[PDB]
Design a protein around this ligand. Structure first.
Ligand SMILES: COC1=C(OC)C(=O)C(C/C=C(\C)CC/C=C(\C)CC/C=C(\C)CC/C=C(/C)CC/C=C(\C)CC/C=C(\C)CC/C=C(\C)CC/C=C(/C)CCC=C(C)C)=C(C)C1=O
Ligand SMILES: CCCCCCCCCCCCCCCCCC(=O)O[C@@H](COC(=O)CCCCCCCCCCCCCCC)COP(=O)(O)OC[C@H](O)CO
Ligand SMILES: CCCCCCCCCCCCCCCCCCCC(=O)O[C@H](COC(=O)CCCCCCCCCCCCCC)COP(=O)(O)OCCN
Ligand SMILES: CCCCCCCCCCCC(=O)SCCNC(=O)CCNC(=O)[C@H](O)C(C)(C)COP(=O)(O)O
Ligand code: SF4
Lengths: 54, 54, 112, 385, 80, 94, 324, 87, 43, 181, 157
């Protein structure tokens, strides 16, 4: 009849189509520092464990 | 170009930083509900216009 | 390599015919191997069939018709060799390996 | 050089794909496609059909972008008939064309990604594909071969509530595109598989008849929706993405951006959709309503005529092209005044694109051949017809 | 006990938990609905009378439209 | 002691028997590529490097600085060879 | 020795069951990432799927193509399957829970790994198919390439421990798990394990859609099943090796009485399960390299880094006199 | 000892037989000097046929720019009797 | 001007540079630090 | 660059003997030329500064059995430089070879193979002119009007020969031609 | 034989359960029907959940789905692939083209039904059949497999 499928009064709510930016993520120095500190302290601990095993 | 940017590029390459995001959002879908239909107990939607068996 | 221009006269067309006939005959051993014909038919019968096909068109006088016939023959040879469709007594379009005809046809059907 | 004969007899790589490659080790020296494995004599069949009976052949050419080919054929017939299409039908046509473009791009991108080993994006994208198939089924009663777009407009009006559901889809589709991108765009393995693969210069693209993404990837700003607009495309805002490197990575990015622009177009069509007729009002070429045909002689007569003999098209000939998802899809239609096409030549972009595989794949690795095939977006229904 | 070998039937039994019985047809098939939103609010399913040898063609016409979301009328309202 | 190797042999015999059972029950119802030679050569070299690493690794506590630097010299020679291979394109498969 | 076969069967049979269910778990996790269900019809929650697939395979007629290498063609899957099985003789699951307490166990594992290549090579050559042969050659080259990095990482652990005994390697991590100071070495080891087991993103035999035929394409019925089973058993083994070398094997996370309540075999199992999950997750997350790219990574990235880690660990331990 | 050329007498007999049993050559005009066209009633197509027959019987291909001179049996035997590829 | 050539080498070959740094630390410690620790022990 | 400018400028600039017929219409600008000038005309249109017709969109045949030269070969071309389309046509018969334009437009290669396959028109200097769409060993040219819709042969598996084979067609229900004229 | 028949029927039930629970089709993706088949394997219908895994090599396949138009040029390739499938094996014809030539029936280049080339077990109608229609066809295949009595027929032979 006289009723057809279409937009509501005022149209539909706006929609985004462009990419959204998520986040940078973990810092590089932080990862370098965590790995380096873990290496140093863990190797010290390896030495302690080796002494105890001996 | 600069020691900081070269360092940040080197860390990102070595630590596979961009590979982490794919792992993370693959894991996010792991806990979400599934879209599978339990055929034949459940069926897909059809319309009155559907063209099936004459 | 490329499609040559049409033969200007019957002499060059005849030369193209001889070239095609040589190429067709030289491919006979490959065909015998591909279709396993050693115990089915002699190579000379293949040569004879090719030459008979050439002879049945010996009345053609238009060089363009001869060029087209040579092109079609080359395509058919290529499909026979490269893309063989083995049947038994048949390669491509050739069968390999006291009453008149009217009575036989009449016994067969009403469509002669 | 050795010869590897590659035919994947499965839709992992097309399905009727057949390639003869000459290799120097793992390096491709020459790629020779063998086609016709899906040649079904469509152009010959069409000559035996009325213009209405011929229409479903076009759904089955690039059978991932059904309505686009419907649209092109309808446009050619409208052009020869000098038939005016109502505005609402124009908007519905464009809306469905852009839905089709999204359907095509999702399939193409994710089948390529699965070919190079990324499995998940295929499933993610095919769920969205299922939603769009539901719009096809709601308007036509078919998931794929709708035969919905016709000379003069569209077969039926939209069911109540469809526009709202399409709007709901558009409200979330951008996040789906973003997920596909984060899976692929920045990943070092994905870049290593696609960057500087299958480089095409603008001169090469013009020489080999490339169109669509295959042409825009080489920096040539060319889109038929803007160069030769049709329906309501000139009332719509959208951008034409172009590449700068002409490689597989640029074409992937262009397809992603084209999906975003298609979403934009769909939103505009939804908001600007007018009321009124969906069929041309010329009573010599369009079916009457069911109630009219059951009530009015003139209508009954026209219905009888239309479904037995079909309409006539005055003697003429023209070439009509549209920007299909795979590139320029064209129809060279010859009419002799009768109710059947005298000649219908179909110009498929995949035919040009696959012909370019030899020069594109030269001196690449064996594993790059499937990547180049995927970036071309070949469907053999249109290549072979 | 059919749940142990037939995992397809198990999924229906699990998802029946909390469901509403909508009707039963002439073959004894039972029709359930949830009124939630997981598959975009599509929560209609049928538990076939035969716990083995069930087949999709056993859904009668009056309930086929309801099951496929073609209509909002149940099999009972269509039959009346 | 070599006592612990006997269970390995019996394990091999049993694994072989399982293999034969599984495989046998269904019977009841011209293009030389030099780069493969080259990768074989490189694997051979570094295989011997690992071979020589094993005793060194277990002996570091006794050989002290002299053993460390002797192994370092060994590695220096082999790594010069590796640099030669790298520059010459032996490590490129394109 | 009369009870030794019982112990061997108590290892082999649960391992085969575990492989059968690893296939199911891979399918389930892959499905759940892909917003689908995966096997859930054959048995409750799909738990009978592996038995059905195995039954189908044994009831499938074998083909055995008319090749001139009739014996070799069937023996190749037997070789790879037996090699996958026999590595578990030296794997300790807890203190004293190990079939063979080999003093040379680390080198034995390296030897088994080096032997693994022959099944693939022989399957490719014996199948009388140029595609299978080429694929087998490429896969073999990849495995030998990443074996170098695996061996060098083994040497790094050996330098830390001072013994080739796997149980001793575990007990040397009582003070600290080796994966903490040697975390980059653990990442390198896991990637090398992926490449060594022909797993994604290194799964060339799975790249049929990329015009790269696998070495087992001509195989059917139980030879193909043997190849598959050996591959998945090797995945479980690589997860176990990652657990033993870097996550302290059967040891608890913290030396506290609360954690010491739960048995060491459970700790070991949980760590192995984490690594298997990472195998599946990685296959779900990324596309695959080309052959040339992965070969370049094997020789140009992982070998130099492994050698550098050997030098750095040995130099540091010698300098401060922290050697075992 | 090993040689490189077929014997002249053998080649003569072979070519004589090939021409004699060809199709349209009565074995009475076939002399070791007989010409294909003037003396054997053979057209150019048939002479090309005979030369192609010479190729099969001796197992090697005769160049196109050389077959134009083989017009009799003597020229034939002169050609094949000294060609190393002949077998 | 060899101070950005090293920068360029690090930017283009991060793996080789990291390997050189790690191995160089492993060589530097016994060559330099160990004799220092031995000398401090004598006194 | 509109179709009025193209028509007028081409009349002014093209050598007269190249074009026999020029049509200006909303259905497309159309130039008809003898077969011996097709190549030179296309080269001119491609190279000339004011035309720059760089893209060959397609080549197709049309069969006209009532004509002495029954085949009409249609070249659809595009200028992305000037956003314009041009149609160039020439006629041909069953035995007269026409010039290939592959050296001008590499895209022509397959379109020419298709014309040869479908209609039987041959192309001089075409590097590789063989059928491209039909089955190997196909006989006839299916898009000719006299070629029957169902063809002459069909295929089926033949168990005694253990292969797919071709036999003359046999139709369970013949194609029904409905003449509404 | 009051005890042998029971054990035989149990064996046959086990064989049928195994063969229905692990059907590994090879797809002959020829035309548009292959897209609906792809949808059947996708997340909404998830053929994996029925134990159906698609294989690349006919050697590891138990079923062939012919999804699309079969041309005369392609028919030998289809037959050869079918001949590499190890027993037991089944064929599903999907869509009008594969069933009887469909819209292309009267064409000069099309095989009028794939059952002229290979024996067909199940015909799935439609152009294309919906993904759910293909799933229904696969359940019909299970029904056919569940009438097999291989062990009983061999015992009596
Ligand atoms: C799609 O990828 C997949 C495969 O590769 C194609 C598979 O092979 C498989 C399945 C392979 C298997 C289930 C092999 C399992 C084998 C076993 C558990 C060991 C043997 C088990 C049996 C039931 C055989 C019994 C043999 C006997 C002689 C009976 C006496 C005991 C799956 C599940 C899969 O998803
Ligand atoms: C990939 C890594 C490359 C590394 C390359 C750099 C290092 C290469 C090796 C260079 C030789 C040693 C350079 C290091 C200088 C420090 C040496 C040092 O610290 O002196 C120690 C002694 O170091 C040495 O003398 C070892 C030298 C290594 C031998 C290198 C070969 C040099 C030439 C050999 C000639 C033989 C012929 C060569 C055959 C090819 C002191 O030890 P000690 O006397 O207190 O007690 C001995 C030990 O602790 C107990 O066992
Ligand atoms: C409790 C959790 C435990 C988890 C244990 C396992 C961890 C997960 C491991 C799996 C992660 C995902 C695996 C899939 C990715 C595989 C692809 C790897 C590609 C690759 O190796 O790239 C190389 C860099 O990575 C590499 O080189 C990798 C090795 C990195 C070693 C780091 C070396 C230096 C570290 C700093 C040490 C300093 C402190 C000591 C003094 C460079 O190659 P490319 O071609 O891709 O280049 C492009 C760079 N964008
Ligand atoms: C297995 C087989 C594969 C290949 C099959 C190929 C089949 C090709 C069929 C068509 C071949 C032709 O007719 S090719 C066309 C052949 N037609 C002509 O040559 C006409 C002109 N006539 C003459 O030249 C002379 O009559 C002639 C006697 C020929 C020689 O000359 P002489 O009188 O001075 O000897
Ligand atoms: S049956 Fe229909 S949908 Fe399927 S391949 Fe044929 S035309 Fe396409």
């Amino acid at each position: 009849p006289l009723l057809q499928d279409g937009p509501p009064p005022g149209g539909f709510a706006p929609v985004r189509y462009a990419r959204r930016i998520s986040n940078t993520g973990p810092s590089a120095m932080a990862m370098f520092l965590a790995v380096s500190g873990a290496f140093a302290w863990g190797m010290y601990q390896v030495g302690q464990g080796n002494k105890i095993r001996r | 170009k600069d020691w900081n940017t070269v360092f940040e590029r080197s860390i990102n390459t070595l630590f596979l930083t961009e590979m982490v995001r794919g792992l993370s959002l693959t894991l996010k879908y792991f806990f979400d509900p599934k879209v599978t239909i339990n055929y034949p107990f459940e069926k897909g939607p059809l319309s009155p216009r559907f063209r099936g068996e004459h | 390599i490329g499609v040559p221009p049409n033969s200007a006269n019957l002499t060059e067309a005849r030369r193209r015919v001889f070239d095609f006939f040589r190429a067709a005959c030289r491919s006979i051993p490959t065909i015998m191997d591909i279709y396993n014909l050693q115990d089915v038919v002699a190579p000379s019968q293949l040569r004879y069939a090719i030459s008979a096909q050439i002879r049945n068109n010996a009345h053609i006088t238009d060089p363009k018709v001869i060029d087209l016939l040579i092109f079609k023959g080359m395509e058919e040879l290529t499909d026979i060799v490269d893309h063989a469709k083995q049947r038994h007594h048949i390669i491509g379009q050739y069968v390999v390996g006291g009453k008149t005809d009217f009575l036989k046809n009449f016994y067969t059907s009403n469509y002669f | 050089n050795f010869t590897l004969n590659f035919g994947p007899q499965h839709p992992a790589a097309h399905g009727v794909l057949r390639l003869v490659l000459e290799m120097n080790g793992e390096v491709v020296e020459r790629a020779e496609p063998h086609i016709g494995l899906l040649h079904r004599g469509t152009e010959k069949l069409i000559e035996y059909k009325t213009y209405l009976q011929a229409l479903p052949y076009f759904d089955r050419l690039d059978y991932v972008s059904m309505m686009a080919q419907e649209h092109a054929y309808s446009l050619a017939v409208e052009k020869l008939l000098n038939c005016e299409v109502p505005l609402r039908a124009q908007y519905i046509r464009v809306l469905f064309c852009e839905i089709t473009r999204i359907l095509n791009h999702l399939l193409a991108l994710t089948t390529h990604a699965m070919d190079v080993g990324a499995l998940t994006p295929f499933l993610w994208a095919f769920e969205e594909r299922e939603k769009l198939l539901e719009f096809y089924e709601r308007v036509s009663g078919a998931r794929m071969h709708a035969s919905f777009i016709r000379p003069g407009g569209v077969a039926q009006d939209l069911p109540l509530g469809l526009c709202r559901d399409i709007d709901s889809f558009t409200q979330q589709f951008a996040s789906r595109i973003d997920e596909l991108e984060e899976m692929l765009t920045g990943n070092r393995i994905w870049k290593q598989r696609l960057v500087d693969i299958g480089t095409v210069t603008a001169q090469q693209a013009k020489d080999w008849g490339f169109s669509g993404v295959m042409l825009r990837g080489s920096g040539v700003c060319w889109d038929l929706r803007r160069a030769a607009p049709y329906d309501v495309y000139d009332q719509l805002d959208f951008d034409v993405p172009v590449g700068t490197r002409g490689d597989c990575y640029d074409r992937y990015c262009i397809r992603i951006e084209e999906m975003r622009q298609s979403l934009r177009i769909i939103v505009q069509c939804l908001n600007q959709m007018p009321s009124g007729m969906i069929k041309a009002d010329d009573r010599k070429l369009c079916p009457p309503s069911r109630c009219r045909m059951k009530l009015s002689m003139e209508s009954l007569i026209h219905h009888f005529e239309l479904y037995t003999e079909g309409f006539s098209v005055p003697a003429s000939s023209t070439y009509t092209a549209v920007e299909a998802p795979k590139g320029e899809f064209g129809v060279f239609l010859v009419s002799n005044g009768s109710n059947r096409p005298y000649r219908c030549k179909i110009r498929a972009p995949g035919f040009a694109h696959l012909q370019g595989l030899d020069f594109m794949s030269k001196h690449h690795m064996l594993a790059d051949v499937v990547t180049i095939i995927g970036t071309q977006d070949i469907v053999f229904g249109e290549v072979d017809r | 006990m059919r749940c142990l070998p037939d995992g397809n039937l198990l999924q229906t039994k699990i998802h029946n938990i909390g469901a509403t019985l909508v009707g039963v047809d002439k073959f004894g098939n039972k029709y359930y609905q949830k009124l939630g939103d997981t598959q975009y609010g599509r929560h209609r399913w049928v538990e076939y009378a035969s716990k083995d040898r069930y087949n999709a063609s056993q859904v009668p016409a009056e309930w086929h439209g309801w099951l496929h979301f073609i209509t909002d009328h149940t099999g009972d309202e269509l039959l009346s | 002691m070599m006592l612990e190797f006997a269970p390995i042999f019996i394990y091999l015999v049993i694994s072989l028997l399982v293999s034969l059972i599984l495989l046998g029950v269904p019977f009841l119802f011209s293009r030389f590529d030099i780069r493969f030679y080259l990768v074989s050569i490189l694997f051979l070299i570094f295989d011997l490097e690992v071979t020589f690493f094993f005793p060194w690794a277990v002996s570091l506590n006794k050989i002290d600085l002299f053993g460390f630097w002797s192994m370092m010299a060994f590695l220096f020679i082999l790594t010069i060879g590796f640099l030669y291979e790298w520059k010459r394109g032996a490590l490129d498969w394109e | 020795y009369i009870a030794v076969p019982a112990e061997i069967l108590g290892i082999i049979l649960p391992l085969l069951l575990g492989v059968a269910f690893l296939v199911l778990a891979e399918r389930k996790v892959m499905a759940f990432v892909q917003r689908r269900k995966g096997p859930d019809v054959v048995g409750s929650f799909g738990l009978l799927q592996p038995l059905a697939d195995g039954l189908k395979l044994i009831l499938k007629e074998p083909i055995s193509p008319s090749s001139a290498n009739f014996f070799l063609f069937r023996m190749a899957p037997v070789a790879t399957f037996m090699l996958s099985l026999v590595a578990w003789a030296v794997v300790p699951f807890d203190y004293g829970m190990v079939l063979s307490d080999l003093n040379i166990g680390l080198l034995y594992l390296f030897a088994i790994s080096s032997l693994g290549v022959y099944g693939i090579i022989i399957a490719g050559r014996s199948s009388n198919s140029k595609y299978a042969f080429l694929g087998a050659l490429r896969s073999a080259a990849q495995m030998v390439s990443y074996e170098v990095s695996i061996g060098l990482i083994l040497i790094t652990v050996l330098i830390c421990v001072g013994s080739c005994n796997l149980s001793e390697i575990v007990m040397a991590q009582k003070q600290i798990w080796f994966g903490i100071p040697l975390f980059p070495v653990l990442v390198m080891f896991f990637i090398s394990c992926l490449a060594e087991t022909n797993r994604a993103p290194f799964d060339l035999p799975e790249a049929e859609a990329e015009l790269v035929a696998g070495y087992n394409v001509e195989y059917s019925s139980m030879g193909f099943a043997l190849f598959f089973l050996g591959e998945y058993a090797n995945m479980i083994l690589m997860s176990g090796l990652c657990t033993l070398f870097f996550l302290g094997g059967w040891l608890p996370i913290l030396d506290l009485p609360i954690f010491k309540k739960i048995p060491g075999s459970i700790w070991f199992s949980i760590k192995v399960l984490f690594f298997l999950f990472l195998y599946i997750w990685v296959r779900a997350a990324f596309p695959r390299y080309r052959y040339d790219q992965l070969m370049g990574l094997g020789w140009k990235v992982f070998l130099p880094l492994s050698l550098a880690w050997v030098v750095s660990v040995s130099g540091l331990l010698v300098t401060f006199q922290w050697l075992p | 000892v090993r040689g490189s050329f077929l014997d002249k007498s053998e080649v003569t007999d072979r070519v004589l037989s090939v021409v004699k049993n060809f199709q349209k050559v009565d074995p009475s005009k076939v002399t070791p000097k007989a010409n294909f066209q003037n003396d054997l009633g053979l057209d150019s197509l048939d002479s090309v046929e005979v030369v192609m027959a010479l190729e099969e019987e001796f197992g090697f291909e005769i160049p196109d720019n050389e077959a134009d001179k083989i017009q009799s049996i003597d020229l034939a035997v002169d050609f094949i009797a000294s060609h190393p590829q002949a077998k | 001007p060899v101070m950005e050539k090293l920068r360029m080498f690090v930017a283009q070959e991060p793996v080789v540079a990291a390997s050189c740094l790690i191995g160089g630390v492993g060589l530097f410690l016994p060559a330099v630090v160990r004799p220092i620790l031995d000398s401090l022990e004598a006194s | 660059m509109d179709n009025q400018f193209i028509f007028k400028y081409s009349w002014e600039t093209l050598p007269k003997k190249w074009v026999k017929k020029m049509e200006r219409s909303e259905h497309g600008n159309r130039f008809d030329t003898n077969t011996d000038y097709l190549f030179q005309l296309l080269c001119f249109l491609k190279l000339h500064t004011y035309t720059r017709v760089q893209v060959l969109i397609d080549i197709c045949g049309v069969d006209y059995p009532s004509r002495k030269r029954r085949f009409e070969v249609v070249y659809n071309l595009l200028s992305t430089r000037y956003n314009s389309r041009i149609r160039v046509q020439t006629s041909a018969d069953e035995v007269t070879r026409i010039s290939s334009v592959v050296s001008l437009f590499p895209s022509a290669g397959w379109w020419e193979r298709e014309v040869w396959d479908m209609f039987g028109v041959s192309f001089i200097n075409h590097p590789d002119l063989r059928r491209i769409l039909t089955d190997y060993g196909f006989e006839g040219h299916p898009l000719r009007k006299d070629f029957p819709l169902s063809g002459y042969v069909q295929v089926r598996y033949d168990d005694p020969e253990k292969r797919v084979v071709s036999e003359p067609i046999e139709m369970t229900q013949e194609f029904r031609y409905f003449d509404f004229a | 034989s009051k005890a042998a028949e029971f054990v035989i029927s149990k064996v046959d039930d086990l064989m049928n359960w195994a063969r229905t629970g692990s059907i590994w089709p090879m797809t002959f993706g020829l035309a548009c029907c292959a897209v609906e088949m792809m949808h059947t394997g996708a997340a909404r219908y998830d053929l994996d959940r029925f134990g159906i895994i698609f294989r690349p090599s006919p050697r590891q396949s138990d079923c062939m789905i012919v999804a699309g138009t079969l041309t005369n040029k392609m028919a030998p390739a289809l037959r050869k692939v079918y001949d590499q499938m190890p027993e037991p094996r089944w064929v599903i014809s999907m869509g009008s083209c594969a069933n009887g030539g469909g819209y292309y029936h009267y064409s000069y280049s099309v095989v009028r039904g794939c059952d002229r080339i290979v024996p067909v077990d199940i015909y799935v109608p439609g152009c294309p059949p919906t993904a759910e229609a293909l799933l229904y066809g696969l359940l019909q295949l299970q029904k056919k497999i569940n009438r097999r009595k291989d062990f009983l027929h061999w015992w009596n032979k």
